[PDB]
């Protein structure tokens, strides 16, 4: 219950231990603008010409991370040491265009109620392992502090080929989603 | 080149675990009367927080007792500023010359690749394009001349 005509996330920082695992991203009406690659300390535009004119200085992301990192240690020992309610995911699949056997389309798996945000989302063609033409998103944010996520597959829509999304989480063991309607 | 700016994550001095931090700027007409929340979150519990409408670092839980003093006595004025220093700056200088003046037009009735959201269930595709499901065909959208039909 908080409304208004638009919303910006010029924060969004998550970090988690053990293994110590971070992301920094900015959203605007629930669409990732960029994410900072913390390893190559650089800004990664969700849509290449999104930062044609516009700049983002990555070191802001890096700082926010290292706050959270420090902020963890100090809220770890102050919840006694409470760990995280693993919740189990909730895939769904649909496509980009409506389907056009001959010409490219793109197939997207939508995984909701993730937490903590580590996951594999892999693609299956007739249960052969598909690694090419695949784009994932960063962990987007849900009002309740889960995350959601989004894997993308470019393909030549030939009936007969059949398409499967596999979601190897923790709270769940896998879960495939064959498509639907 | 214009520059997108960022709300600043505040430190505190002193079996898997998650920290989170959200930097929420909400806008009404843009410009006029604007709001800002910064959540400081443990696992799923939002322990600490700053609302633009409270102008002070509250807590929400029992785990923001030994935070929310130290955030007012270190981040308070800088943070209050964030409303204009960052929320505002970003709205005016960056979203307007991109993520508002780009729209994209659409394509038992289902319609693809449209932006922004307003049209006349709803799916977010998260690649700055949209879809919706409703049960000649008239889809009226604010990106258009002649509200495309067939």
């Amino acid at each position: 219950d908080i409304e208004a005509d638009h919303v910006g996330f010029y924060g969004t920082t998550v970090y988690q231990s053990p293994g110590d695992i971070g992301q920094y991203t900015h959203e605007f009406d629930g669409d990732e603008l960029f994410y900072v690659d913390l390893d190559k300390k650089k800004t990664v535009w969700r849509l290449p010409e999104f930062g044609q004119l516009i700049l983002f200085e990555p070191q802001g992301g890096l700082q926010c991370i290292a706050a959270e990192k420090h902020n963890l240690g100090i809220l770890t020992k102050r919840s006694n040491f409470t760990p995280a309610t693993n919740e189990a995911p909730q895939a769904t699949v649909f496509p980009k265009s409506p389907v056009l056997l001959g010409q490219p389309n793109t197939l997207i798996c939508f995984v909701d109620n993730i937490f903590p945000p580590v996951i594999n989302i892999t693609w299956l063609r007739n249960s052969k392992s598909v690694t090419d033409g695949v784009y994932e998103t960063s962990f987007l944010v849900n009002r309740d502090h889960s995350f959601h996520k989004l894997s993308y597959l470019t393909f030549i829509p030939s009936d007969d080929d059949i398409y499967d999304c596999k979601v190897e989480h923790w709270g769940l063991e896998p879960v495939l989603k064959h498509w639907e309607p | 080149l214009v520059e997108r700016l960022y709300l600043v994550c505040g430190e505190e001095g002193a079996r898997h675990f998650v920290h989170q931090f959200k930097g929420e700027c909400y806008f009404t007409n843009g410009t006029q009367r604007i709001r800002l929340v910064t959540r400081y979150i443990y696992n799923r519990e939002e322990y600490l927080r700053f609302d633009s409408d409270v102008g002070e670092y509250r807590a929400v839980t029992e785990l923001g007792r030994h935070s929310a003093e130290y955030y007012n006595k270190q981040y308070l004025e800088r943070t209050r500023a964030e409303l204009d220093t960052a929320c505002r700056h970003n709205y005016e200088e960056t979203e307007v010359p991109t993520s508002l003046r780009r729209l994209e037009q659409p394509n038992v009735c289902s319609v693809t690749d449209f932006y922004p959201a307003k049209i006349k269930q709803l799916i977010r595709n998260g690649d700055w394009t949209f879809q919706v499901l409703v049960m000649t065909c008239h889809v009226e959208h604010p990106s258009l001349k002649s509200p495309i039909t067939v």
Partner: T-cell receptor, first 112, second 116 residues
Framework: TLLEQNPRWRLVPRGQAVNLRCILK??????MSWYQQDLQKQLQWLFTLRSPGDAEVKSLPGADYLATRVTDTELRLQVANMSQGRTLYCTC?????????FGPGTRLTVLE | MEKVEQHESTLSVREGDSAVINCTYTDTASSYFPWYKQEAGKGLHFVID?????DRKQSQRLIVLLDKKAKRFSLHITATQPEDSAIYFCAASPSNSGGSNYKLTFGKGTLLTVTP
């Protein structure tokens, strides 16, 4: 208050090398930067070094600088190839968006 | 970069005149302007600051102010006093750009001598 620099006054048989150490005296001001004031007054930022073992080099007209945050409360500068004089000020700060508090500085005059 | 340039390299005014120092900065993201004070080859002393939410601040005799749009900002020492006499530097920093949050860009100095 706040910071102790060391030394205050030094000659630099040119180009050659010499160094100095600033010590924090209160941890409400944890961020510690380095500034140079050149010979016609005029401050330049050099380094801000947050976390210990964080350490960098800047080559500047006309000196060369190895700066290194060695502890929670020590900061160090080595300065060499020192061309003409300058004064070095250690700072410290409670944070981002917040005033710097300057040290008592170190004057460096070259010696031919 | 930020260039932050102090129009005016000297001022003499005598007691009870309002000394005014003027600066400009280039970079539209700057939002934290502190001013500093140096007497007689000693250290710098933080004097006052101001943020880009507000257009003016005022404290004790001093008052500082800021036309974001103009990218100009000024410090007004008021009812001057021989003790005030020093080199005053203005400075800038974008408090919400991570590239330089942690640093200050400084003007050149302005030497204020306030005469008995």
């Amino acid at each position: 208050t706040l910071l102790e620099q060391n030394p205050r006054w030094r000659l630099v048989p040119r180009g050659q090398a010499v160094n100095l150490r600033c010590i924090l005296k209160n941890s409400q001001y944890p961020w510690m930067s380095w500034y140079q004031q050149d010979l016609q007054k005029q401050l330049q930022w050099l380094f801000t070094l947050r976390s210990p073992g964080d350490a960098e080099v800047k080559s500047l007209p006309g000196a060369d600088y190895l700066a290194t945050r060695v502890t929670d409360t020590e900061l160090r500068l080595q300065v060499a190839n020192m061309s003409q004089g300058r004064t070095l000020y250690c700072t410290c700060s409670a944070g981002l968006g917040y005033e710097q508090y300057f040290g008592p500085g170190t004057r460096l005059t070259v010696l031919e | 970069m930020e260039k932050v340039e102090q129009h005016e390299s000297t001022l003499s005014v005598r007691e009870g005149d309002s000394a005014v120092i003027n600066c400009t900065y280039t970079d539209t993201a700057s939002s934290y302007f502190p001013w500093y004070k140096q007497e007689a080859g000693k250290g710098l002393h933080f004097v006052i600051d101001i943020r880009s939410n507000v257009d003016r601040k005022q404290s004790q005799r001093l008052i500082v102010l800021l036309d974001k749009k103009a990218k100009r900002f000024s410090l007004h020492i008021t009812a001057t006093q021989p003790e005030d006499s020093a080199i005053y530097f203005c400075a800038a920093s974008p408090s919400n750009s991570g590239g330089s949050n942690y640093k200050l860009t400084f003007g050149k100095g302005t030497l204020l001598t306030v005469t008995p």
